[PDB]
Structures are given as C-alpha cells and as structure tokens.
Design a protein around this ligand. Structure first.
Ligand code: HEM
Ligand code: HEM
Ligand SMILES: Fc1cccc([C@@H]2C[C@H]2CNCCc2ccnc(-n3ccnc3)n2)c1
Ligand SMILES: Fc1cccc([C@@H]2C[C@H]2CNCCc2ccnc(-n3ccnc3)n2)c1
Ligand SMILES: C[C@H](O)[C@H](O)[C@H]1CNc2nc(N)[nH]c(=O)c2N1
Ligand SMILES: C[C@H](O)[C@H](O)[C@H]1CNc2nc(N)[nH]c(=O)c2N1
Ligand SMILES: [Zn+2]
Lengths: 403, 404
C-alpha cells in the first residue's frame, strides 16, 4: 500500500503516504511502467473537486470546520447547482497556484514554492489586455536581473466558449527559420510557432536569436500578434571565464524562463492561460537548449575551438565541450547579475525540499527522470534518491496546441 | 490508433508501439495511482504453465511451433513434473534460455551482443571445490587476456528438499572494504559486509585499497567454503591519464572482468541460484559510479584538488570537470592495456541499434530508462531522448536475498 523510498548514498528510508491522496491515474500499470514518457497518451465531479479544494484551503489557514469554511462550501454548492460552475476568491486562487507548483513532480525548483507572486488577470476581456498583463508579469519577474517567481492567471475555461490561450510555449522564445537547404536557422524547437507568427503578419528577422512576438488569443477570436518591447526582454551574452574565443561564437540567452502553454487546474476549475516563471537552472540552457542535437546543437563547434578530437567518442570531446558550455552560462549570468542556479545547488535544495515535504505531508511527488540533471547525473544527490511519482491537485497539466 | 504503449524518440520525432509487453507474465511495481520505476528494489500447476510457456518460446525460436517434437517435449515436461515435481532442460534449451534472459534484462545497455553469449553448462557440479574450478575456467575464458568474451556459467537448479548452490560474493571480482577504527573505510565501502564475512570464514585480510576478495562458495546444505583466486587469473589495469601526468601517481586501478555472481537465472519456472555471468565494462560504471560515488571510492575531491579546481563553490563545476577526466583516464588506460571497454557514447549508440532490431524482431524491448541513461552526460547520449517501456519478460535474471 505505502511505497518504501530509499536513498542509496545515505541508507535512509522513508514511506510515502501522501500518494494515497492521489485522485488521478498516471500512465503506468502493473504490466508495464511508462514513467519515461514525456506526454500522456458531471456537476457532481466538479462539486467533489471543489469541496476538496475548499477543504484544503481552510485547512491551510488553520480554519477547518469554522463558520467561514462552512459558509464558503455553501456558496460553492449554491453556484454549481445554479450555473454548473463556480468562481474562486483571490486568496483561494493564490493558495491553489502555490499548491500546483508544490505538486509539480517535474520541477526541481520547488523549495521556493511558498514564495510565488500571483497576479489575478481574471478580469481580462481581450488579447490587448492579455498583452498588458503579460508585459507587467515580465517586468515584475525580471526585476533587473534579480528574478522573482510569478504567475499571472487569465480567465478560467467556460462551457461552450473558446479558451483564453497563449499560443507560444514560453513568453520569451527565439525564432527558428526553416531555410530552403533543409536546415534550420535559430531554434528548431520553434519552427512551427515561428511560421504561425509569420502567417499572422509578423515580419521575421534572420538571426539565430530573434525574439518571437506573442500570439495571444481571446475566446473564439483569431489570435493577435504582439511584439514585446526589447527593453523588457533581458538577455545575457555568453562568454567563458578563461576561453577568450568563446564570446566570439555570438551566443546569448534570455534571463526569463516563463512557461505559457500549460493548463492550471484548481478545484475542478481550469485555467488555460496561466503563464508562470522562475529562474533558470543552468543546465536547461547550457546542456539542453544549446547542446541537444535537435536544438542549437553547438557541441561540435565548441569542441573544435577547443581543438579536441572529434574523430572518436572515446576522447570524451562531447563531455568536455558540454562542461565548458555550462560553465560559460553560469559565469555569464553571474557577471550580468541575473539569477541562475547550477545543477548541484539546485539538486541539494531539492533534497532539502523532499525532507521538508516528508515531514509536512508524508511524501513528495517527483519525476526522477526530470529531476536528475542532463549532465553529471550521479554526481548530484538526487540520482541516488528513489522517488515516487503521482498526480495531486491543484496541478499544472499539458494541453493541446490551440491550432 | 493501436491499443499498445506509444513510444517516441524526441530527437528524431519517430514513433513506435510496443506490442511485446503483452507477453509479460509478471507484474512490476507500478500502478495507475503511482509510478515506482525509480526504485532499485521494489505448486506443480504454476510450474507447468511456466514450463509450457518456455517450451513454446523455444520451439518458436527454432521455427517448429505445432510440430510433433514440440508437442512431445510438452508431454515429456508434464510427465517429469507429474512424477518428480520438477523437470530438466535440454542443453540447447538452456543455451536459448540464458540468451533470452540477457536479451530480456531491462537494465543492461549491452544487449546488442545478446546472441553472442558463451553458455557453460555446469549442471553436473557437485562440490564447492568443483564450483571454484568452473569459476576459474569462466574467468580464464571470459578474460581472454584482455579480449573479453561474454559468458555465463550455469550451476545446478534449485531442487525441492535440497539447499541451493550459492555464490555469496556479489561479483566474481570485487575489492575488500576494511572498516577502520576512526569509522572510515579502507577500500570499497560497497563490500564491507562481504569482507567481514570472508574474515569470519577464515580469510587472512590484507589492508590495501584494492585487495581482491576471495570467493565464498556454497554447495547444497553445506557451509560456504573459501577460495582465493590465483592473482594471475584476475586481470587488472592501472589507471593513468593521457595528459595529466600526476594521475598515475594516485595509484588507482580497476579489474578487467565485470562478472555478476549473485543473481538468480529463471527459465521456464526452473531457478538457477548460481549462474554467474560476465561481459565487459562500460567505462562510466568504473569512472563515475565505482570511483566517484560518495558511498564508494569517492575520489572526486582528491582529483579536483590535483587539478587545482575551486572546490569551495558548486558553480565552478569542479565535480563535473573532475568526473570527465577520471572517465577519460579509465578509457585511456583500458585501451592502452588492450582490455575491452566501451564508452557511454558508443554503448548508447549501439543500444539504439539494438532497440531498432528488437522493434522488428519482437515488436518492442523492455528497458529501464534510469539505468540505461549513463550517470554522466546523459542528454548528450541518444538514449536520453528515447522513451522506453519497462516490463518483466521471462526467462529472466532476478535479484535474490543474500544467503546469510
Ligand atoms: C524559482 C525557480 C525555479 C526553478 C529553478 C525551476 C526549475 C525547473 C526545471 C529545471 C524544470 C525542468 C523543465 C525542463 O527541463 O523542461 C522545471 C519544470 C517545471 N516547473 Fe519549475 N522552476 C522554478 C520555478 C517554478 C515556478 C514558479 C513554477 C509554477 C508556479 C514552476 C512549475 C513547473 C512545472 C509545472 C514544471 C514541469 C514543466 C513541464 O512539464 O514541461 N517552476 N522547473
Ligand atoms: C557484453 C557487454 C556488456 C555490457 C557493456 C553491459 C552493460 C551493462 C550495464 C552498464 C549495466 C548497468 C549495471 C549497473 O549500472 O549496475 C548492466 C546491467 C545488467 N546486465 Fe549487462 N552488460 C554486458 C553484458 C551482459 C551479459 C553477458 C549479461 C548476462 C547474460 C548481462 C546482463 C545484465 C543484467 C541481468 C543487468 C542488471 C543488473 C542489475 O540489475 O544489478 N550483461 N549491463
Ligand atoms: F512537444 C512537447 C510536449 C511536451 C513537453 C515539451 C517540452 C517539455 C516541455 C518544456 N517543459 C518546460 C520547459 C521550461 C522552459 C522555461 N521555463 C521552465 N520553467 C520555469 C519554471 N519552471 C520550469 N520550463 C514539448
Ligand atoms: F543492495 C543492492 C540491491 C540491488 C542492487 C544493487 C546494485 C545495483 C546492483 C549492481 N548491479 C550490477 C552491477 C554490475 C557489476 C559488474 N558487472 C555487471 N555487469 C556485467 C555485465 N552486465 C552487467 N553489473 C545493490
Ligand atoms: C524521453 C525522456 O523522458 C525525455 O528525454 C525527458 C528526460 N528527462 C527530462 N528532464 C528534464 N528536466 N527535461 C526534459 O525535457 C526531459 N526530457
Ligand atoms: C535511485 C536510483 O534508482 C538509483 O540510484 C539508480 C539510478 N540509475 C542507475 N543506473 C545504473 N546503470 N545503475 C545503477 O545502479 C543505478 N542506480
Ligand atoms: Zn512507472
């Protein structure tokens, strides 16, 4: 019933009892484990999800069974009975957003979970207003390089009405231009979104690091294009502490990691546009974004500037170049006074979070394959830590692309 | 469309479906409620159905399903179980089964080599002394003066009303771990218990960082007997670095032959409690895990100090830098010494070729992503980007409790 979780570096053992509170099935069965997969393959339901969330909320403020708790359940029930849905109070919304971050099994930054600035954008009626809200989010979150975690929450989904959506997967993303020679200029992950922007009237550049406009969509309307004021998008030129030629590569990356295509679920309510941001863990940039074969793919270039032997895998040229690239990102961000956390510091804080959560809730949902960094896996403490994965609500969730 | 797990490669955008998992007869640890896949360790009628299933697998592999010889073997196996409670594998059945168990092992990245496995039948073994002889032969053959060859030696199966053949050591070759008076450990902390067991059984212990352990071998219903491997049979490689000249002065070394000796080999319901197998190392096994794990030799800080790195801050990436050079040293030294080894790049590439082979041959391949992805430079290898389905097929290798 209760999974036994072991750390193999320390020999310590916990028991996850929190998993029992999961109301949603993952993709695994006793026959086969599908844990390495990236994506998933009435009014009484909503009401039960609502009562549960409201119960969580009043529990969190040490007010269970109190009159305001009882009265709040009646409101929710009254509203659902009459309208098929209900609405959250701002304080409840704030609670729900923090819990969803807390419950996100793939996020290594969760030690920070209680410190989230929540912007209520539920009074938004147009793409233009979404743009204003997003611009303020970016300004606030970026804070001249001293990054602060934030989420802005747009109006919830409603029956038989189009969703508010941000079409971009992040608020800040570099264009990928499919050249005719089959190659890709810029970021290949973004070829499609780049093409949608062009179709909807965007004048493209021809750089490797052209910041994309946002396609914002108000319900049942064509999306609208919005260029971000370049002074809002903080960026960090990449150079290397000891290799002078590195800066010549023309490499750079943006400060603000803001996810804008995930769905936020709270108490049965769904928020289809609720962009959030924290700060980068350096491997996301140095390893995945810059070195993935299907991304900027710079490994061989850097390796050659380092005069390494590309001819054979056994010279570990890839491993060597990857380390210098990650060191460059960390150095550069530190020099530009922009918040960043290395994979060692991050995983150490995550272990502390696991311990905090073990005492607070009896467990912590974690996706080992995502928590372990893409380089130097076993060099970090989380590699040696068993982990249980499961879905708790409030939750962040993937959703289909609006097109 | 298809009612089977959809598996995606995110580097190449290609998709497959695993139909093979439908053949899984054993539940793993996961449920729809929670995934437990990161966990390291999470009656005649029964035997007969396992036996019938294996015999069917065997006759399929030789393309004789439905044949007279197929149906006679089924009747032959059921008769044996009916009168003895158990049965016995033909020689070629054992060879097939051993290979299929390796082919089926979700955690082994070396499975491209699965068809090339030398199977030594030792089911006639009747003493601990004889077990030692068979093991020495295995080591000699498998080591082959550095030109390593995959092999397994199969000792007699569990018999009802009789004690097991057991090799107490977790590997045929492992280094002693001596608990110190200050609480530290000299040698390999992984092997402290087995080391103390060897001493309790009369071994005269050394006091180096790399003393080869003797073997504790247990014949049925007898106390384990102790055997020292003649040093010339145990091939070792002193570790040096191709450019850092001081690395050789660290006096680090590792053994050539990676031989797992404590796992249970299950075929058709028959259980072989002693069936040691060996391949060749993937270099990260030694350079990253054995040498840099905090609870193993833990040499990262020592090497980083020699490299004059800033060990006072995480953001200098001193651990990453040191780990790279250690792995390079491992590869460089094995190659210099002409001892077979494979780096994590070549290994993972070959495993991808294996996935493609198995997709065509069986409609999938059970694989443990957390074990297949190497402990350094994960996303720089192609397997990181490959979704993987994990499930238990049989024949299988399984963990089994330590015999003490
Ligand atoms: C404060 C510093 C933060 C750090 C260092 C951090 C770190 C990370 C990292 C490295 C990932 C893996 C992403 C990937 O590799 O694609 C991740 C995932 C995730 N994080 Fe964070 N995060 C932070 C803040 C936040 C905040 C404020 C939220 C929400 C309010 C959040 C929610 C999530 C979610 C839902 C995922 C999974 C994304 C997906 O499945 O694509 N994180 N985090
Ligand atoms: C020929 C070259 C081989 C290579 C490069 C190789 C590689 C590996 C590696 C890297 C692991 C992970 C073990 C760990 O990290 O602790 C592993 C596990 C495993 N291998 Fe191999 N292997 C090879 C040959 C063999 C052979 C001949 C067999 C059996 C017939 C085998 C069966 C297994 C099994 C059962 C495991 C799981 C071990 C466990 O769970 O503790 N491998 N292999
Ligand atoms: F096609 C796809 C289907 C599912 C997921 C995919 C890639 C994994 C999703 C990216 N995951 C989040 C990436 C990201 C980017 C920027 N910031 C964060 N971030 C910020 C705070 N915490 C995480 N995360 C592609
Ligand atoms: F206490 C424990 C409980 C379960 C597993 C554990 C460690 C993971 C098992 C070691 N796994 C095998 C390591 C190994 C060593 C030498 N050779 C191989 N090998 C040889 C061919 N293929 C793999 N494997 C401890
Ligand atoms: C197939 C595999 O699950 C996929 O490559 C995962 C692995 N772990 C990851 N971990 C993080 N942090 N981010 C990712 O995108 C992925 N991708
Ligand atoms: C907790 C985690 O499951 C454990 O440390 C695993 C991770 N992946 C591994 N992968 C391999 N190849 N070998 C291992 O011993 C482990 N250990
Ligand atoms: Zn699972």
């Amino acid at each position: 019933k209760f999974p036994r979780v072991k750390n193999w570096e320390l020999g310590s053992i916990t028991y996850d009892t929190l998993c029992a509170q999961s109301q949603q099935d993952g993709p695994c069965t006793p026959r086969r484990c599908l844990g390495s997969l990236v994506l998933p393959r009435p009014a009484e339901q909503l009401l039960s999800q609502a009562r549960d969330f409201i119960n969580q909320y009043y529990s969190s403020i040490k007010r269970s069974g109190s009159q305001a708790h009882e009265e709040r359940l009646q409101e929710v029930e009254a509203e659902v009975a009459s309208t098929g849905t209900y609405h959250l109070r701002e304080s409840e919304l704030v609670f729900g957003a923090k819990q969803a971050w807390r419950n996100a099994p793939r996020c290594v930054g969760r030690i920070q979970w209680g410190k989230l600035q929540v912007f209520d954008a539920r009074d938004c009626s147009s793409a233009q207003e979404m743009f204003t809200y997003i611009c303020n989010h970016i300004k606030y979150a970026t804070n001249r390089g001293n990054l602060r975690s934030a989420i802005t929450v747009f109006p919830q989904r409603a029956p038989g009405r189009g969703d508010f959506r941000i079409w971009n997967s992040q608020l800040v993303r570099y264009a990928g231009y499919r050249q005719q020679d089959g190659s890709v200029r810029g970021d290949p992950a973004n070829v499609e979104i780049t093409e949608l922007c062009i179709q909807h009237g965007w004048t493209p550049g021809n750089g490797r690091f052209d910041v994309l406009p946002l396609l914002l969509q108000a319900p049942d309307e064509a999306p609208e294009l919005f260029v971000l004021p370049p002074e809002l998008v903080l960026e960090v030129p990449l150079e290397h502490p000891t290799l002078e030629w590195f800066a010549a590569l023309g490499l750079r990356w943006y400060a603000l990691p803001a996810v804008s295509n995930m769905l936020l679920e709270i108490g049965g309510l769904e928020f289809s546009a609720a962009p959030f941001s924290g700060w980068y863990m350096s491997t996301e940039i140095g390893t995945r974004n810059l070195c993935d074969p299907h991304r900027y793919n710079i490994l061989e270039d850097v390796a050659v500037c380092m005069d390494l032997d590309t001819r054979t895998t056994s010279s570990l040229w890839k491993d060597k170049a990857a380390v210098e690239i990650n060191l460059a990102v960390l150095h550069s961000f530190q020099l530009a006074k922009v918040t960043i956390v290395d994979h060692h510091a991050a995983t150490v804080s995550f272990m502390k979070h696991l311990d905090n959560e073990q005492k607070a809730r009896g467990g912590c949902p974690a996706d080992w394959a995502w928590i372990v960094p893409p380089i130097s896996g076993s060099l970090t403490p989380v590699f040696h830590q068993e982990m249980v994965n499961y879905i708790l609500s409030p939750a962040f969730r993937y959703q289909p692309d609006p097109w």
